[PDB]
Design a protein around this motif. Structure first.
Motif, mmCIF file in Angstrom:
data_model
loop_
_atom_site.group_PDB
_atom_site.id
_atom_site.type_symbol
_atom_site.label_atom_id
_atom_site.label_comp_id
_atom_site.label_asym_id
_atom_site.label_seq_id
_atom_site.Cartn_x
_atom_site.Cartn_y
_atom_site.Cartn_z
ATOM 1 N N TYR A 45 54.168 24.700 29.504
ATOM 2 C CA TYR A 45 53.786 23.186 30.140
ATOM 3 C C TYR A 45 52.533 23.367 31.130
ATOM 4 N N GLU A 46 52.637 24.348 31.834
ATOM 5 C CA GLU A 46 51.561 24.241 33.013
ATOM 6 C C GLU A 46 50.478 25.560 33.072
ATOM 7 N N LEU A 47 50.943 26.706 32.943
ATOM 8 C CA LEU A 47 49.734 27.816 33.020
ATOM 9 C C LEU A 47 49.333 28.311 31.847
ATOM 10 N N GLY A 48 50.014 28.128 30.643
ATOM 11 C CA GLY A 48 49.639 28.911 29.382
ATOM 12 C C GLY A 48 50.297 30.243 29.097
ATOM 13 N N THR A 49 50.130 30.875 27.906
ATOM 14 C CA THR A 49 51.009 32.015 27.678
ATOM 15 C C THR A 49 50.117 33.190 28.247
ATOM 16 N N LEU A 50 51.145 34.026 28.738
ATOM 17 C CA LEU A 50 50.500 35.172 29.399
ATOM 18 C C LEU A 50 50.778 36.439 28.346
ATOM 19 N N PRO A 51 49.703 37.035 27.815
ATOM 20 C CA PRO A 51 49.752 38.206 26.892
ATOM 21 C C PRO A 51 50.312 39.219 27.569
ATOM 22 N N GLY A 52 51.072 40.254 26.803
ATOM 23 C CA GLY A 52 51.363 41.518 27.433
ATOM 24 C C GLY A 52 50.228 42.514 27.382
ATOM 25 N N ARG A 53 50.554 43.756 27.782
ATOM 26 C CA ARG A 53 49.771 44.831 27.690
ATOM 27 C C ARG A 53 48.882 44.924 26.451
ATOM 28 N N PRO A 54 47.601 44.895 26.406
ATOM 29 C CA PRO A 54 46.913 45.188 25.061
ATOM 30 C C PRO A 54 46.871 46.616 24.531
ATOM 31 N N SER A 55 46.862 46.528 23.176
ATOM 32 C CA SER A 55 47.123 47.570 22.503
ATOM 33 C C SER A 55 46.318 48.949 22.872
ATOM 34 N N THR A 56 45.065 48.767 23.368
ATOM 35 C CA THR A 56 43.991 49.644 23.754
ATOM 36 C C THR A 56 43.848 49.599 25.246
ATOM 37 N N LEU A 57 44.161 50.810 26.049
ATOM 38 C CA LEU A 57 43.819 50.333 27.333
ATOM 39 C C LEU A 57 43.343 51.896 28.099
ATOM 40 N N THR A 58 42.110 52.222 28.513
ATOM 41 C CA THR A 58 41.617 53.089 29.077
ATOM 42 C C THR A 58 40.981 52.913 30.364
ATOM 43 N N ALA A 59 40.804 53.819 31.412
ATOM 44 C CA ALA A 59 40.178 53.678 32.600
ATOM 45 C C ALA A 59 39.531 54.985 33.201
ATOM 46 N N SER A 60 38.445 54.966 34.066
ATOM 47 C CA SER A 60 37.727 55.890 34.760
ATOM 48 C C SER A 60 37.373 55.541 36.164
ATOM 49 N N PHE A 61 37.275 56.365 36.957
ATOM 50 C CA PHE A 61 37.084 56.227 38.249
ATOM 51 C C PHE A 61 35.628 56.798 38.408
ATOM 52 N N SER A 62 34.791 56.169 39.419
ATOM 53 C CA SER A 62 33.475 57.069 39.825
ATOM 54 C C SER A 62 33.027 56.311 41.148
ATOM 55 N N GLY A 63 32.529 56.919 42.184
ATOM 56 C CA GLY A 63 32.080 56.503 43.284
ATOM 57 C C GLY A 63 33.301 55.734 43.838
ATOM 58 N N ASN A 64 32.876 54.311 44.235
ATOM 59 C CA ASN A 64 34.376 53.808 44.792
ATOM 60 C C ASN A 64 34.530 52.482 43.663
ATOM 61 N N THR A 65 34.104 52.746 42.315
ATOM 62 C CA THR A 65 34.515 51.817 41.387
ATOM 63 C C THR A 65 35.531 52.340 40.213
ATOM 64 N N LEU A 66 36.310 51.347 40.069
ATOM 65 C CA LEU A 66 37.481 51.540 38.680
ATOM 66 C C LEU A 66 37.008 50.882 37.573
ATOM 67 N N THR A 67 36.701 51.623 36.481
ATOM 68 C CA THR A 67 36.326 50.746 35.261
ATOM 69 C C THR A 67 37.754 50.776 34.395
ATOM 70 N N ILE A 68 37.819 49.576 33.939
ATOM 71 C CA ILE A 68 39.107 49.239 32.864
ATOM 72 C C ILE A 68 38.250 48.847 31.556
ATOM 73 N N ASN A 69 38.949 49.343 30.665
ATOM 74 C CA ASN A 69 38.845 49.082 29.275
ATOM 75 C C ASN A 69 40.051 48.409 28.426
ATOM 76 N N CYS A 70 39.670 47.358 27.877
ATOM 77 C CA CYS A 70 40.853 46.788 27.198
ATOM 78 C C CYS A 70 40.417 46.746 25.719
ATOM 79 N N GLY A 71 41.463 46.792 24.632
ATOM 80 C CA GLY A 71 41.077 46.556 23.368
ATOM 81 C C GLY A 71 42.588 46.027 22.747
#
Length: 362
Positions: A45-71
């Motif tokens: 009724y208020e906030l909408g459906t919260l999806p679970g963890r996506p099927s594809t999730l990869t990440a990498s860190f460089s400098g001071n930046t974290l990159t997140i990839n979702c599929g």
């Protein structure tokens, strides 16, 4: 929970310890079920459906930046967060994920993660509905409002940190914070993501620490306060469905004391301020009820609340510094500092808004 249920009006704040169908909550396990129920209702009724963890999730860190990839289902997105490290502390560092950087002083020995919630879900105006990376992945018509989308993002940031220890963040010591519109978001993140150990909603007002019911009452008495009916016209923070109940709040099988209660027994410190539009008395009455969830679980000092006079919006006051540090040390640094903090210059009005008792959960 039945797919088809009939809502009923309740002028006062809903009983946190009674299931929707009337079953009594008397055990800690049962309360866990009750929390799941309130989360389910809130999403419907208020906030909408919260999806679970996506099927594809990869990440990498460089400098001071974290990159997140979702599929997910042929679709894919990518987003980043920046990290700042403390001069003190031992790596991996505990950290606070701040929406837009948040508006709190950087805690000693705690890393700050700047989360650009806007890119996950835009909040320029009503026209931002369905726009953002979350939607580029789940669809422009997904029921999730922006705050739910934001929470989903935070969960992805945590998943990524788990995948990349090179980011040097202790994934068992992560908090979340945000001020004003981002405060409402931080509250939802803490509520929906159980891995968050400390939730710090700052001056979140309507949509955050305030209860829809109390704010409506205050408005009907002439207070210049933000309410549910007015807030949904500023941004797509809530689901479109919420627009159908905004002018009939009493029928909602919950209120924001329920939302806050989803964080129990985990750490929660509501940093408020006396600005009429926020509805400080509504926030205090609301959180006073929410606190009963922790009281029932035997961990009252895990949730604090503080409103001390008035000050510039989102300008963290020095008179609240020791309180914030107490919660940071306890939940992010594992210390035993005292966290018995619960105050406001307004009356909670419990006899008017709370007509249920608090059980000692077994």
């Amino acid at each position: 929970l039945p797919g088809s249920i009939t809502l009923r009006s309740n002028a006062k704040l809903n009983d946190l310890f009674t299931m929707f169908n009337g079953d009594k909550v008397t055990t800690k396990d049962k309360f866990s079920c009750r929390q799941a129920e309130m989360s389910e209702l809130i999403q419907r009724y208020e906030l909408g459906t919260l999806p679970g963890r996506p099927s594809t999730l990869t990440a990498s860190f460089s400098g001071n930046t974290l990159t997140i990839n979702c599929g997910e289902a042929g679709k894919s997105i990518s987003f980043t967060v920046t990290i700042t490290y403390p001069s003190s502390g031992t790596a991996p560092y505990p950290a606070i994920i701040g929406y837009g950087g948040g508006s709190l002083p950087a805690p000693a020995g705690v890393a700050m993660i700047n989360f650009n919630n806007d890119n996950i879900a835009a909040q320029v105006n009503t026209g931002s509905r369905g726009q953002g990376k979350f939607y580029d992945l789940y669809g422009s018509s997904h029921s999730a409002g922006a705050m739910t989308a934001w929470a989903w993002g935070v969960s992805r940031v945590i998943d990524a940190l788990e995948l990349v220890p090179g980011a040097r963040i202790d994934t068992t010591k992560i908090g979340v914070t945000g001020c004003s519109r981002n405060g409402k978001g931080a509250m939802v993140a803490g509520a929906f993501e159980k891995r968050i150990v400390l939730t710090l909603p700052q001056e979140s007002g309507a949509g955050g620490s305030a209860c829809w019911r109390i704010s409506d009452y205050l408005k009907s008495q002439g207070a210049n306060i933000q309410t549910a009916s007015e807030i949904i016209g500023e941004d797509p923070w809530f689901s479109t469905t919420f627009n159908s109940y905004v002018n009939q709040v009493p029928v909602l099988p919950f209120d924001h004391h329920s939302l806050a209660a989803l964080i129990a027994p985990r750490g929660l410190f509501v940093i408020d301020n006396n600005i009429d539009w926020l509805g400080p008395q509504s926030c205090f009455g609301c959180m006073t009820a929410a606190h009963m969830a922790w009281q029932a679980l035997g961990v009252s000092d895990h949730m604090g609340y503080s409103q001390i006079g008035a000050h510039a919006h989102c300008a963290f006051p020095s008179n609240q510094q020791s309180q914030l540090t107490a919660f940071v040390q306890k939940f992010l640094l594992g210390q035993s500092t005292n966290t018995a903090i619960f105050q406001s210059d307004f009356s909670a009005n419990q006899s008017q808004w709370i007509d249920w008792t608090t059980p000692t959960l077994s």
